[PDB]
Amino acid sequence: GSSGSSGAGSATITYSVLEETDRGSLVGNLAKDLGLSLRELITRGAQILSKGNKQLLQLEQKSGNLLLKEKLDREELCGSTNPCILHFQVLLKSPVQFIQGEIQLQDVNDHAPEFMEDESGPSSG
Q: Where would one find coiled-coil regions in this protein?
């Protein structure tokens, strides 16, 4: 059997946060993101990996919320530059595991219509 081939995409998670994010601001949910439980995140010790020395993130690991270390700067990360995405990774302990998350800039400006969803019905004849 054979059926062509294709598939790409490194980023697994994408967060939303401005650029002037204040220190101690909730970037997003990690344990709730993957839909995992704090415990699971705790057991596997889930932390934020940003930069070699001094991290710009700190997962309290209490409610699964990404906390900023300090007040960002600009150039340090991106500052204007595009796409302007933070570079981080979720570190896990035995079983040691790592993820390739991402931080998208708060580019909220669409909203779009939405209101619940539920559809399903086959057809044939």
A: none
65, part of any domain: yes
Burial class for 107, CB neighbours closer than 10 Å (0-12, 13-18, 19+): exposed
Method: NMR
CA distances to 9, 32, 85 from 100, in Å: 10, 16, 12
Domain with residue 45: its CATH number is 2.60.40.60
SS (H, E, C) the chain: CCCCCCCCCCCCCCEEECCCCCCCCEEEECCCCCCCCHHHHHHCCCEEECCCCCCCEEECCCCCEEEECCCCCCCCCCCCCCCCCECCEEEECCCCEEECCCEEECCCCCCCCCCCCCCCCCCCC
Q: Is 3 within the bounds of a domain?
A: no
Q: Length of the chain in residues, anyone?
A: 125
Domain membership of residue 2 (yes or no) is no
**Other C-beta atoms lying within 10 Å of the C-beta of residue 88:** 22
Q: Extract the tokens encoding 97.
A: 């595991």
